[PDB]
Paper text:
At the end of 2022, the XBB.1.5 variant emerged, a descendant of XBB that acquired two substitutions in the spike (S) protein, S:G252V and S:F486P (S:S486P compared to XBB.1), and a translational stop in ORF8 (ORF8:G8stop). To gain structural insights into the recognition of the ACE2 receptor and evasion from neutralizing antibodies by the XBB.1.5 S protein, we performed cryo-electron microscopy (cryo-EM) analysis of both the XBB.1.5 S ectodomain alone and the XBB.1.5 S–ACE2 complex. We determine the structural basis for the interaction between human ACE2 and the S protein of XBB.1.5, showing similar overall structures between the S proteins of XBB.1 and XBB.1.5.
B Cryo-EM maps of the XBB.1.5 S protein (same colors as A) bound to human ACE2 (gray) in the one-up state (left), two-up state (middle), or RBD–ACE2 interface (right). A common feature shared by ACE2 receptors bound to the XBB.1 or XBB.1.5 S protein is that the N103-linked glycan of ACE2 is positioned towards the active site inside the ACE2 structure.
Numbering used by the authors:
A (entry chain B): 24 to 66, 86 to 143, 154 to 177, 187 to 244, 259 to 304
B (entry chain C): 305 to 470, 490 to 620, 640 to 675, 689 to 703
C (entry chain B): 753 to 827, 855 to 1051
D (entry chain C): 953 to 1051
E (entry chain A): 953 to 1001
Amino acid sequence: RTQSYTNSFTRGVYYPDKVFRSSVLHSTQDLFLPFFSNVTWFHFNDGVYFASTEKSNIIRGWIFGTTLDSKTQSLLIVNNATNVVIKVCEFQFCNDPFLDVESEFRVYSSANNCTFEYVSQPFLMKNLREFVFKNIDGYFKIYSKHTPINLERDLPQGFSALEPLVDLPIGINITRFQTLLALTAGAAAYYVGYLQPRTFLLKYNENGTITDAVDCALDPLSETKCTLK
Amino acid sequence: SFTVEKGIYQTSNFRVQPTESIVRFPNITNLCPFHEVFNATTFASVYAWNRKRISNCVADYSVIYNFAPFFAFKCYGVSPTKLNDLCFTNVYADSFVIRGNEVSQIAPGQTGNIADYNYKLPDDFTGCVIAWNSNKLDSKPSGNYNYLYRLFRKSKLKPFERDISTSPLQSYGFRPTYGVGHQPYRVVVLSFELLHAPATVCGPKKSTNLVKNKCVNFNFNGLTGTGVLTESNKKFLPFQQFGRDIADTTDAVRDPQTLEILDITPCSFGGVSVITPGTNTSNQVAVLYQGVNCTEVSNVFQTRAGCLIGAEYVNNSYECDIPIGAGICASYQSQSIIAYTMSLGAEN
Amino acid sequence: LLQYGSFCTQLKRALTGIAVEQDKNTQEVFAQVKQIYKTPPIKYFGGFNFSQILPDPSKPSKRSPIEDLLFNKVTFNGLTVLPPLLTDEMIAQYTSALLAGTITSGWTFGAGPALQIPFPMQMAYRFNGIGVTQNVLYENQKLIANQFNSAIGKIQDSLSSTPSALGKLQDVVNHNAQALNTLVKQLSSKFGAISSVLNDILSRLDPPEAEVQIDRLITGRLQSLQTYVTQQLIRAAEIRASANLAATKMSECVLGQSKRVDFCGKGYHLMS
Amino acid sequence: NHNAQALNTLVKQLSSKFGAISSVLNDILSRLDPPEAEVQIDRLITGRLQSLQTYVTQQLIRAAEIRASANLAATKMSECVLGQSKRVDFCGKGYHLMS
Amino acid sequence: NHNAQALNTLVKQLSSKFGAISSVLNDILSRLDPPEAEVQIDRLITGRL
Ligand SMILES: *[C@@H]1O[C@H](CO)[C@@H](O[C@@H]2O[C@H](CO)[C@@H](O)[C@H](O)[C@H]2NC(C)=O)[C@H](O)[C@H]1NC(C)=O
Ligand SMILES: *[C@@H]1O[C@H](CO)[C@@H](O)[C@H](O)[C@H]1NC(C)=O
Ligand SMILES: *[C@@H]1O[C@H](CO)[C@@H](O)[C@H](O)[C@H]1NC(C)=O
Ligand SMILES: *[C@@H]1O[C@H](CO)[C@@H](O)[C@H](O)[C@H]1NC(C)=O
Ligand SMILES: *[C@@H]1O[C@H](CO)[C@@H](O)[C@H](O)[C@H]1NC(C)=O
Ligand SMILES: *[C@@H]1O[C@H](CO)[C@@H](O)[C@H](O)[C@H]1NC(C)=O
Ligand SMILES: *[C@@H]1O[C@H](CO)[C@@H](O)[C@H](O)[C@H]1NC(C)=O
Ligand SMILES: *[C@@H]1O[C@H](CO)[C@@H](O)[C@H](O)[C@H]1NC(C)=O
Ligand SMILES: *[C@@H]1O[C@H](CO)[C@@H](O)[C@H](O)[C@H]1NC(C)=O
């Protein structure tokens, strides 16, 4: 776990609602990832932007919890080759839990109690995978995007929307999150950024796909652009 | 006045009435677990209350009417009589038992020990509160002290939260010898979240068939109104349901039962103008429907200003007498009302 | 709403008055002459070349090249737009009549019957009206004709090059668009009510409890309409003043020769 | 005509209710209890104040136009009557002689 | 004189009550509960508009 600092650039734009628009310049106000921010490089707060580019499929699932104890229900997502499972069951996490590859003893002691259960098609599929995780007013939202990329150590420059992927009515306490691995030692890298409230000016095309955005609080020129629409 | 001078006057407007009504709703007929919420014969204490998220089912409330003779039934955001037509985004159920004298303690903009130390509500709350006596069920002859209530706390409770940590807790005394004002009443708080959006728990009513190219009322899972439904061409992505424009108005709908895009257009409307010479001259009139083609209604003549009825078009050109619109004028001439293209002046 | 009074009659009357005034402005500016004069078939006027301002018979709409460039260079819930009474072709015919009358007669057709006069003689008369004798014109005819031709030629390029040369005409359109957009965007406000949709309020509350919510919407919408109407009246006054000035200029700089300074351009006036 | 109709509208605006049980002060004050009658009074107060404001604004807007016309008349008196004017089409159609 | 009179009137209009319990926001907020403070705030807002 070696830290690094890098620049976010123009990444992390998602559709705020489920309404179709075209040939308009709309203005919205929500939690976002500000343009050109110091995102951290690994080898929760309001929300999380996660970015990965590995191919070995060493990464799958996440841990979300407040007390990190089985006494209180803690969100736990597992992702394997054929399905994805979301358990809001009670889990007693180990010191450094991970997938054994295939027992679940090291992931958790046991599930004495459980509330929510979900199973569906796995999220995961040169290529960059981006995910936005955020919970608000007792709801969990996960947005995702897969995009082919060229050879580039840092994040690509451009625009790409984050289509909605899943919504869950979980309604629990989340304060901290940790990364799950399925391991023989090795190395991996991923990018983490944090979201805070912002006002944005989103631009739509004739097909209804977001193509450009403006951060209204970045510099005076952007404020002028926002006030002139 | 009883005499009208020569000219053109605007009298009123016209609109196209709807033909019929179209209702659409999901296939499913799952019944909501409201019965499970009720007649449980065991309800939690006032300070320790359970939640429940009702979803993916049909909500019927007349079963609550046939369930018990409720003592108190208050609603704030909606009207009690027509709960059977709305569709709510989500439902939150709170169930507990409180002393009969404390029924009115819990309410928005209200203060009380139960109000501030057991359960709190927001100022803009939307929902209902139901209550009725259960003395014959939850009152032991020697006293039912299993029900407790909190009385002491450093801080007031926030809206929509549960507290279990724990003498602040005092046990109740319920005996059949007691009268009104002390017997236990069971109470349920129902909370909705109206969002004028597609929702899980709709009403019991049933859909109908779908029509096109006809002015008609519609009700698509709460999207009510009137208009003309036609086939659409917009490229809706799987999560796209509605549609808007620069003016922020609905212009497309996703059909629930058969996933398809439907364009909505407003029905025809406009103004009506009356062309007449003086009453002392003649007694006939002509009518102009502004900005409407003649299909929407000497008999007919289509101009740029709309549809003209009662006037005869002619080749010749004269000086303008009664202005109509884009270069057209009307006049009285064995005798009738004619319309023509005005003349700018004699050639030279 | 019927309990609030008779505001709607006042609104309708004000809007109708504005529209009638709009028609009268154009009528007063352009419909000066009584005859439709026509230019002769042979366009030779002593060396002066008017082809840039006379109507072009090749194109269908019968407009001069400069008029074409000007035409090309300028670009609901109970709200309707009414068409103007005079089409563009009629205005073009008025303009062509004025040009033919001024080319073939001078200032005589504005005071009575039109009387012929050769163009160089008219130009000599106009020189004699600023303190210069006729022999100055008659001995420098070709130089003056060439200078006039070049000056006319430069106008199309001057109009095309400068971007904001026609800002005055664009401002009217922009203000009308902004006012209408604001008026229609005001419909989605709540004004301290449960919702901005009357259908939802009528289908979620008892009849006695709905009036309290409906009154707020009614008051807000009445206030919005009143503000829009007042702004429209104030703008109409300014437009009327502009139209009056334009009519004065048409009568004094086109139908005659003006002695007022800087009224018909910078220099000594000759024609327009 | 306009000066008469404006006054008639202003007078006829008194009998409107503006969202109150009655459109007369004496009856509504005699019957109802003041602690809830003051709001009913306030509604009428605002309703009538708006009518007064509208009337005054319209009168100002008309007065501006009348002043413009009066200035034009003063100029025509100074130029066409006290002298002979060379401006085309300012003192009638033709060559001006007098007025 | 006209400009000065207009500004002075506009400034002095801030101390009117417009049929509310007071003309200071801070006094109303720090005395009444939030569900009733708006009933008095809206009148002040309308008058100032
Ligand atoms: C009047 O001026 C016009 C504009 O320059 C002349 O039309 C040009 O004529 C030349 C030669 O005939 C052409 O090469 C140009 O393309 C023409 N210009 C346009 C815009 O069509 C016209 O010839 C002049 N009239 C006379 C009698 O000389
Ligand atoms: C599981 O739930 C039971 C009650 O159903 C509770 O007594 C027990 O403590 C819970 N287990 C935990 C919190 O680990
Ligand atoms: C993957 O997860 C699903 C979820 O139940 C499980 O059924 C399956 O056995 C797991 N393994 C494979 C190889 O699919
Ligand atoms: C959630 O956990 C945090 C941190 O332990 C705590 O401060 C908070 O009170 C808990 N509950 C909610 C509703 O945030
Ligand atoms: C919009 O969609 C049309 C039809 O699929 C397509 O031809 C056009 O290229 C699209 N516009 C883009 C991709 O900018
Ligand atoms: C609803 O029923 C129709 C007709 O039987 C069918 O075509 C459609 O697929 C059904 N949809 C769902 C979600 O069950
Ligand atoms: C005639 O009415 C139809 C509507 O049915 C409209 O589409 C069409 O444009 C109208 N014709 C003309 C010439 O305006
Ligand atoms: C004049 O009358 C003829 C009759 O054949 C007609 O074809 C033509 O359209 C008329 N001209 C108009 C209506 O302007
Ligand atoms: C101008 O005068 C000449 C004589 O030199 C004549 O041939 C010509 O026709 C005249 N122009 C016109 C338009 O008649």
